[PDB]
């Protein structure tokens, strides 16, 4: 006995416009390939290869750049120069 009112006359929704003809034949193999590649993260897992890449590019490589950047900080002063003069500071 609880129904939305008899005074609605609600209809269908169109988006409106022109049916453009198909300029592309979709390939099922390429479509499911790309749908597998974009949503790759929902099925990614940790293996030995994944862990090796994550150990290098997230941990070891920022640490190597950190060693190089914080050690060689105010060494070089190549502004003028001469012969026999100090090229570094430390």
């Amino acid at each position: 006995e609880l129904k939305p009112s008899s005074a609605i006359q609600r209809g269908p929704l169109n988006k409106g416009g022109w049916d453009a003809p198909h300029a592309l034949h979709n390939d099922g193999a390429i479509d499911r390939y790309a749908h597998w590649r974009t949503f790759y993260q929902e099925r990614f897992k940790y293996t030995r290869a994944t862990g090796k890449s994550t150990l290098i590019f997230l941990v070891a490589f920022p640490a190597l750049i950190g060693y190089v950047a914080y050690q060689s900080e105010g060494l070089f002063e190549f502004a003028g120069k001469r012969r026999g003069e100090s090229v570094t500071t430390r």
Partner: peptide
Amino acid sequence: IRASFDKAEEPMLGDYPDIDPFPAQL
């Protein structure tokens, strides 16, 4: 599956058909 990177992607695919990779040139 021939190369070591093709082997390393076996546990990701769940519904993918897993075909043999062969060069398009050969």
